[PDB]
Amino acid sequence: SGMALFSAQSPYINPIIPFTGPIQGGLQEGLQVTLQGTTKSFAQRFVVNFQNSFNGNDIAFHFNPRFEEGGYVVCNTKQNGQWGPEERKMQMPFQKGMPFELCFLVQRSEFKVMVNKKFFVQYQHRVPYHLVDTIAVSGCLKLSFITFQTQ
């Protein structure tokens, strides 16, 4: 599929939303974290957070699709409870009430984000990704699974 991928941690299958769970041993270079799910018809926004611990005060990468103002997606980092400068991509690659595949690839200098197998946005690491030991997902959606795979 381009490349041979191997599980790095067992999948979370049908996780309950809102979901907070471990990324075991922390994010690693070449890790692909894939979310397969569906947005609800009543969704306005949803969030995937890659964060350090359960509390949400330190979020290395906040990925936040907003079905507002035509549809756009916000990427940001939170440090000690403070949001940094937002990066917005003025495009909405998700459709309300429709299935989606969302994949985050950890590279040395950036995250690469694919939506429905197509590249969507990159995000430069502002803090070391290996400090990320938690994924948190919220919003009006369900998930079939989250997988963790490496080359």
Ligand X SMILES: CC(=O)N[C@@H]1[C@@H](O)[C@H](O[C@@H]2O[C@H](CO)[C@H](O)[C@H](O[C@@H]3O[C@H](CO)[C@@H](O[C@@H]4O[C@H](CO)[C@H](O)[C@H](O)[C@H]4O)[C@H](O)[C@H]3NC(C)=O)[C@H]2O)[C@@H](CO)O[C@H]1O
Binder among 25, 86, 95, 124 for ligand X (CB under 6 A):
86
Q: How far apart are CA 131 and CA 128, in angstroms?
A: 6
Nearest-angstrom CA–CA distance, 12 and 128: 24
**76 makes contact with ligand X (CB under 6 A):** yes
Answer yes or no whether residue 68 interacts with a second copy by CB under 8 A.
Answer: no
- Establish whether the linkage from the previous residue to 18 is cis, with ω within 30° of 0: yes
Cα–Cα dist 145/122, whole Å: 23
**CB closer to ligand X, 78 vs 106:** 78
Q: 89 or 142, CB closer to a second copy?
A: 89
Q: Where are the beta strands (DSSP E) in 1-151?
A: 6-13, 19-22, 32-39, 46-51, 59-66, 72-79, 82-83, 87-89, 99-106, 110-115, 118-124, 134-139, 141-150
- In angstroms, what is the minimal distance from the CB of 64 to a second copy? 13
Binder of residue 62, out of ligand X, a second copy, none (CB less than 5 to 8 A by kind): ligand X
Residue 2 sits in the site that holds a second copy (CB under 8 A)? no
- By a kind-dependent CB cut-off of 5 to 8 A, residue 64 interacts, out of ligand X, a second copy, none, with ligand X
Binding stretches for ligand X (CB under 6 A): 62, 64, 69-70, 74, 76, 83, 86, 90
